[PDB]
Design a protein around this ligand. Sequence first.
Ligand SMILES: *[C@@H]1O[C@H](CO)[C@@H](O[C@@H]2O[C@H](CO)[C@@H](O)[C@H](O)[C@H]2NC(C)=O)[C@H](O)[C@H]1NC(C)=O
Ligand SMILES: *[C@@H]1O[C@H](CO)[C@@H](O[C@@H]2O[C@H](CO)[C@@H](O)[C@H](O)[C@H]2NC(C)=O)[C@H](O)[C@H]1NC(C)=O
Ligand SMILES: CO[C@@H]([C@@H]1OC(C(=O)O)=C[C@H](NC(=N)N)[C@H]1NC(C)=O)[C@H](O)CO
Ligand SMILES: CO[C@@H]([C@@H]1OC(C(=O)O)=C[C@H](NC(=N)N)[C@H]1NC(C)=O)[C@H](O)CO
Ligand SMILES: CO[C@@H]([C@@H]1OC(C(=O)O)=C[C@H](NC(=N)N)[C@H]1NC(C)=O)[C@H](O)CO
Ligand SMILES: CO[C@@H]([C@@H]1OC(C(=O)O)=C[C@H](NC(=N)N)[C@H]1NC(C)=O)[C@H](O)CO
Ligand SMILES: *[C@@H]1O[C@H](CO)[C@@H](O)[C@H](O)[C@H]1NC(C)=O
Ligand SMILES: *[C@@H]1O[C@H](CO)[C@@H](O)[C@H](O)[C@H]1NC(C)=O
Ligand SMILES: *[C@@H]1O[C@H](CO)[C@@H](O)[C@H](O)[C@H]1NC(C)=O
Ligand SMILES: *[C@@H]1O[C@H](CO)[C@@H](O)[C@H](O)[C@H]1NC(C)=O
Ligand SMILES: [Ca+2]
Ligand SMILES: [Ca+2]
Ligand SMILES: [Ca+2]
Ligand SMILES: [Ca+2]
Ligand SMILES: [Ca+2]
Ligand SMILES: [Ca+2]
Ligand SMILES: [Ca+2]
Ligand SMILES: [Ca+2]
Ligand SMILES: [Ca+2]
Lengths: 387, 387, 387, 387
Amino acid sequence: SVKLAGNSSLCPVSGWAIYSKDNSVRIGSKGDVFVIREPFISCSPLECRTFFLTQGALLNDKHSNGTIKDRSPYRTLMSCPIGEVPSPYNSRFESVAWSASACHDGINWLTIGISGPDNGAVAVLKYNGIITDTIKSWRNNILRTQESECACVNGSCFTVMTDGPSNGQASYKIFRIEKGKIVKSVEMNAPNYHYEECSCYPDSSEITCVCRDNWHGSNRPWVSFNQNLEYQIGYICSGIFGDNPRPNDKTGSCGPVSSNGANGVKGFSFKYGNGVWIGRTKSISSRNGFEMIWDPNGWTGTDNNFSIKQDIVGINEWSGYSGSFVQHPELTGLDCIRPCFWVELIRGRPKENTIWTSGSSISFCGVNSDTVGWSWPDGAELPFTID
Amino acid sequence: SVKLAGNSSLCPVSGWAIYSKDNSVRIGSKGDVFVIREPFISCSPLECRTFFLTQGALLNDKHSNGTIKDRSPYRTLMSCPIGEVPSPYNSRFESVAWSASACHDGINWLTIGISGPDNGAVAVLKYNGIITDTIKSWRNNILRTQESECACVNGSCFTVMTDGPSNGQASYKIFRIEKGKIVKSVEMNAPNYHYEECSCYPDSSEITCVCRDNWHGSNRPWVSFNQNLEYQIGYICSGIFGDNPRPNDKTGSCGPVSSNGANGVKGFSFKYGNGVWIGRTKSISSRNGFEMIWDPNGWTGTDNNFSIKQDIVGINEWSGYSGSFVQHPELTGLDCIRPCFWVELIRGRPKENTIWTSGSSISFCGVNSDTVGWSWPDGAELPFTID
Amino acid sequence: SVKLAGNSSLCPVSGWAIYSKDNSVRIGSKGDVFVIREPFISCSPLECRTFFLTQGALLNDKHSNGTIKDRSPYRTLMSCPIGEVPSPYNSRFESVAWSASACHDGINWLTIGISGPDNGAVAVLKYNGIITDTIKSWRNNILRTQESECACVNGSCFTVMTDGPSNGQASYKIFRIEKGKIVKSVEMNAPNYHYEECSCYPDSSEITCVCRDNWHGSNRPWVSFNQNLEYQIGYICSGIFGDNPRPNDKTGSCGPVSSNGANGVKGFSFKYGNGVWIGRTKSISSRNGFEMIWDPNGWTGTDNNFSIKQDIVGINEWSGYSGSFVQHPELTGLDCIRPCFWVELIRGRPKENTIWTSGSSISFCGVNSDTVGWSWPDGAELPFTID
Amino acid sequence: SVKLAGNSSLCPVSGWAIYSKDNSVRIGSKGDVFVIREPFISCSPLECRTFFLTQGALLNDKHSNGTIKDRSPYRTLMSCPIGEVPSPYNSRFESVAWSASACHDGINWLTIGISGPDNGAVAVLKYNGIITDTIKSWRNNILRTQESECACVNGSCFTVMTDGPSNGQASYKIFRIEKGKIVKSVEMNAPNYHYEECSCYPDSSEITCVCRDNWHGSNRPWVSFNQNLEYQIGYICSGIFGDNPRPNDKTGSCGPVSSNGANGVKGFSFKYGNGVWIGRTKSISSRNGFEMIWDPNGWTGTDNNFSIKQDIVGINEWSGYSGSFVQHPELTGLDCIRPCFWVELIRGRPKENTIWTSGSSISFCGVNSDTVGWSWPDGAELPFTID
Ligand SMILES: *[C@@H]1O[C@H](CO)[C@@H](O[C@@H]2O[C@H](CO)[C@@H](O)[C@H](O)[C@H]2NC(C)=O)[C@H](O)[C@H]1NC(C)=O
Ligand SMILES: *[C@@H]1O[C@H](CO)[C@@H](O[C@@H]2O[C@H](CO)[C@@H](O)[C@H](O)[C@H]2NC(C)=O)[C@H](O)[C@H]1NC(C)=O
Ligand SMILES: CO[C@@H]([C@@H]1OC(C(=O)O)=C[C@H](NC(=N)N)[C@H]1NC(C)=O)[C@H](O)CO
Ligand SMILES: CO[C@@H]([C@@H]1OC(C(=O)O)=C[C@H](NC(=N)N)[C@H]1NC(C)=O)[C@H](O)CO
Ligand SMILES: CO[C@@H]([C@@H]1OC(C(=O)O)=C[C@H](NC(=N)N)[C@H]1NC(C)=O)[C@H](O)CO
Ligand SMILES: CO[C@@H]([C@@H]1OC(C(=O)O)=C[C@H](NC(=N)N)[C@H]1NC(C)=O)[C@H](O)CO
Ligand SMILES: *[C@@H]1O[C@H](CO)[C@@H](O)[C@H](O)[C@H]1NC(C)=O
Ligand SMILES: *[C@@H]1O[C@H](CO)[C@@H](O)[C@H](O)[C@H]1NC(C)=O
Ligand SMILES: *[C@@H]1O[C@H](CO)[C@@H](O)[C@H](O)[C@H]1NC(C)=O
Ligand SMILES: *[C@@H]1O[C@H](CO)[C@@H](O)[C@H](O)[C@H]1NC(C)=O
Ligand SMILES: [Ca+2]
Ligand SMILES: [Ca+2]
Ligand SMILES: [Ca+2]
Ligand SMILES: [Ca+2]
Ligand SMILES: [Ca+2]
Ligand SMILES: [Ca+2]
Ligand SMILES: [Ca+2]
Ligand SMILES: [Ca+2]
Ligand SMILES: [Ca+2]
């Protein structure tokens, strides 16, 4: 039993092979499946698990009513083996939460679950299911975190949290956590930046996060840092805009792109030098479709040219949140950190005429062997009996 | 694999961080969830489990009819991982019982399950699921026990049982149990006292129990003892009355407070010198709401002043039973015994127009980092389809 | 990991403490519970499991139709932890079978499952879930076995099988099995005897079986043997008749009691010298009620006097099959083999107006501490929605 | 933990003893059971598992509509313990796939799952649930594989894949895989042959596959090879034709039998010198019934005589796919590789008036002790409530 090193580089990849699909909503039509949203994947040296925020209710039951709502005392962070439907019969309880993160340092699971009132939320940190720390809202305005896996390097795991307005300047903090205890934090000095729901991963002993600007950027902000939390900040320069909503592709900016900049969706990207693997919706205006784009100079370059595009979900199909997750050499036996990603497929409100909102998931892992584009949509037929 | 020492002191705490919430009733609207009551939490060196008394039926089924009833041949003690719904598909069978206790000595689980007729009930003791002892009613009047975890110190576990009237003087016995075998017992000499449903915990090699006086006390009786069963008795002196029902807060008594003293509810409190952490309903007349109060001299002082109050369940929401559970250093890695507590959220009869009665649960653990008050209620919408 | 010795004597006991109750039928009203019958319990050095013959269908589903039928290609032997409901979600598959036995030798599980046509049934023997042997019908007339646990001594396990008429002289064979392989068998020379559904247990290195005479005995036949299959045969002499149906208690016989001798029910008894613990229905004419009787000279004496009687199921409640199971010192840490027993509570056809037949179960273990009589019935309300 | 040797010979067997039956469709009438097809069994040194292709839906739910369809983005390869129903609550997720294979090399599970578009499908290979390789369609015409277990010898596992027309000459490749990585492949030079859905097993360090000719053969093609992929090809010569559909038994051919040669069904056979154990439907025109036939010179001889026939499923009952699986000495303790087989029992479309298509399964293992023929059919009553 040993700590993840996290000191090797990210595996370069040429394409994405499908890894999992849970068909949660299709199955929940009859089976006992949690109403969920904000799912994410995270692995240990032994297994990969799907984490998710339940709504404390099951699909096709009356208690799924009004589940478009983001926060409540009923939401809980739970997890199950990857690819399985989130059910009360196969799910491990993690924490009470309407915002969350989780990651394995090689020894145990760290989970972070935020609950409580909007004006004084509290993040409860657990290590091996034991409460080890808490951090309370410092701006009294919806303390919130990744909704994807934290990143671990040599026994230290890192996350980002935000507190403050969703439509203006907020406050962003980076945390270093050891055995579930916060050992260091720093507030990012990022005037005119907006960070939410960061997708963070380790790469050569350091952490890179690609996040969501809900205020005024249709491209994605990023923050990178070493174990001592010495950080750098910026925005993805590519004219291949990564957020949703967004403008049509055109000349980009290394700062926040104001056009269609308000609102957004959780997403991710993988940096490789000046290049970037961009995951994004296919629609510029709604959470529909998904695609992976390789842009060889997209991290630092502003043009809208790219080299590779791989279809993941058809433009006429619902998508939603997406996030990175990695597989360490301790798990794979490789000499690099393998990048994977998941996509949330959201069904129900507000776009569909149901009483409920829930999602299923798909995931892919990066490879250098042959791959293919396609569409792996949710596939449920709405409305349900309960609607 | 080693016996719990139980020789360190109780961890002082400034607040309570939320630990679990199962949403059992909300989920049971569709899912296969046991009708239950009298749940409690108990931990081993490895995990924490929710124990509970089923009614041998599932929610939203006709067999849940009449489950306001306390005792029957169908009630069974079962357990599942903390935070999960009590289902036939994830629950371990423990014992046949309509009253129960359980605890882990560091090596194995001890469970105590009382079943049989009101005039001759028998407690069946199990160690690692094997019957190790029995104790039969000695007053022929509803032998009954904790409905929360027993307490273990250096290979010996302790509990309290009551036999006799619920509305007058009864008989109370303390038991010392080793590997599931009763090695010693003593009858408490407590004229004018009434003890039921004790919440007991270890603290510096000795046991402290805070219980329910159903006869004539609106404050809570307590009994403490060493491994030798040499005991002391009294009542919590604070004018912050702990039982339900109870009078409005006023000058208290170190004896039983007669005002609104009849009837009651299972509860708990944590002693710290002259001070006390009091968990109680918010309503003085019904099982509604829940709050934690820190009263620096409430154990021995009679005034109605206090220093800290933390909201747990809103006054307009149903609560019910509550009980202590601890986490030992063998589990946490701390240098003290950590105090936690659970709350039963009762739904159905008699206050609601259903055919059934059942509960869900929430739990919290004590910390010295930042916390927040809120309301984490049951959240089910009654009546159900079966009603 | 070591073979059960089985060389200590049976623990003498003064009473029976309740061990488990699954409430299968009550729960199956909504939950996904197998339609079953012929359940039995058996333990390893680590755990105790309920074995049972499914009807390849669930309660309250149309496929439960006609399940009064004894034999079909759909019946399967499965098992789950004791006290849990037999569900597709918690049950281990053992074998395809409409008659069965099983037991643990201390190393692995032996299971015996008989399937195939009435005129050529085949018993499939498995050791650790791997087929190790088969034995085919030798009289071409419904090869059938214990429907309770086989008995193991020093790495050898033993069972009894019957082939031939249910209403006249049949053929009875004893088998010695090692690691799932039949190493020896012998045909019992028992003219005028009838043996079915034996309840066998180990006691001082030898095996004692108490069985069912379906031909012409209202008392129970027995067969005992050593590891070399050298056997003795007889009938329980007590005037406290053990079968169902049976006459009112009166002077008994050490041979088959012809009065009400036809038909019967699976049962058990524990021999202690000239004495016997008798488990039986309360009704002399139907499968209702259950009681344990201690008759100090009932094994060899013909009078109808007895010393102890303990109620188990009320006479106005349904019972059914019953069988012995033991707990070895390797499991309990005792210096003797502890006797326990289970009772099948049959609901549905032919006595009740349903389309189906199924059972739940209760179990008890022998102790020398205080116990109490009561009634722990099935408790389901029939008919069900499907009827 | 050690690699399977696979160097012993196949165990000669005289008959087949029933091993498992899951009753999936009967149970799925009420329970939460996946709609599935193309099930198969495969074992490790420790356990045997049922693999299967779900339709991302449950029985008796509207999402089972149209499941006669072979390929979709919703189909997933999952597995559960043998004999258990495939449920979301007991099934492990393996891969996203509408065609698949899997096998254990003694250390870990290899799974192969093909998904993507018909004109560019991709096989994703996993070792211990981690993606280790991919192979993409080379003829752009429905890349497809075994639908039964791959075969492992000394740390190398082997499979066969096909790409191209289902009604004419296609392309067939053999693969050698080590720890989930393709280390060698070769295209079979088989003009006028057609290979699909091979059932492959190890025997004396080499691999033998019996497959399906969908083009123009009513007998079955075979391919055998050593670890070096040096292969031999041919057709089973016996006049006891093995495919479905097929002509009435008559003089056979060692080449493809054109009569009723178009179309077919997945099947298997076990070679013993010039002899062959043939598993086949009972009907020559439809997927009904199943039987095992021993033909002492059927591998190389063209006559229609045989020595042994054992009934498995009645001619008036539905069958479907069938495939071999083996149990290695590492699992059984035998000095040979034991032959077993499974049968898919298909219910629904196109032969039955339902909206759905799904299957249950039975399995048998070869023995030299006594066995019996019978019929162990699916047993579900169609249509269902959803139809
Ligand atoms: C979910 O919530 C909606 C809104 O409360 C429910 O629809 C309402 O039903 C109530 C009671 O019949 C009426 O007073 C309103 O007119 C309805 N509102 C609307 C907008 O239709 C709905 O019944 C709930 N669904 C379930 C399954 O409980
Ligand atoms: C169980 O079986 C019985 C007997 O087949 C079914 O009752 C029959 O229903 C059929 C079709 O409606 C009628 O032809 C007969 O008149 C009925 N027989 C009797 C004795 O009532 C019954 O419907 C089945 N139950 C279920 C749930 O499938
Ligand atoms: C308030 O909305 C935020 C979150 O956005 C949304 C979404 O579907 O866009 C889901 C979350 N739901 C949950 N995590 N439960 C949010 N975040 C929270 C904390 O509400 C947003 O990033 C603006 O601040
Ligand atoms: C008789 O009522 C006692 C118990 O009261 C409570 C209650 O909700 O107040 C539930 C229990 N239900 C169960 N434990 N099943 C009781 N205790 C019993 C043994 O009935 C009380 O303490 C008075 O003696
Ligand atoms: C034929 O009846 C025999 C069995 O009896 C009965 C019963 O409820 O009485 C249940 C069984 N059901 C099953 N084991 N499935 C039987 N035995 C069998 C093999 O049918 C009897 O002992 C006479 O020979
Ligand atoms: C196209 O049909 C092929 C397969 O046929 C069968 C069948 O029931 O006959 C089911 C499969 N279903 C799945 N494996 N999902 C097929 N194979 C595929 C890849 O569709 C056939 O062998 C001809 O090429
Ligand atoms: C990464 O960490 C491992 C484990 O400590 C160490 O042995 C190795 O030197 C590091 N790798 C590199 C490339 O620095
Ligand atoms: C508590 O028990 C432990 C374990 O035996 C012992 O080593 C230690 O001395 C004790 N601690 C105190 C403070 O007495
Ligand atoms: C029973 O078997 C044990 C284990 O082999 C042996 O040591 C012991 O002598 C036996 N007990 C008796 C009473 O003979
Ligand atoms: C088969 O493999 C085993 C394991 O390596 C080896 O020891 C043995 O010699 C082989 N058996 C034969 C018959 O070659
Ligand atoms: Ca934005
Ligand atoms: Ca570019
Ligand atoms: Ca009171
Ligand atoms: Ca005070
Ligand atoms: Ca259900
Ligand atoms: Ca009889
Ligand atoms: Ca007598
Ligand atoms: Ca063909
Ligand atoms: Ca021949």
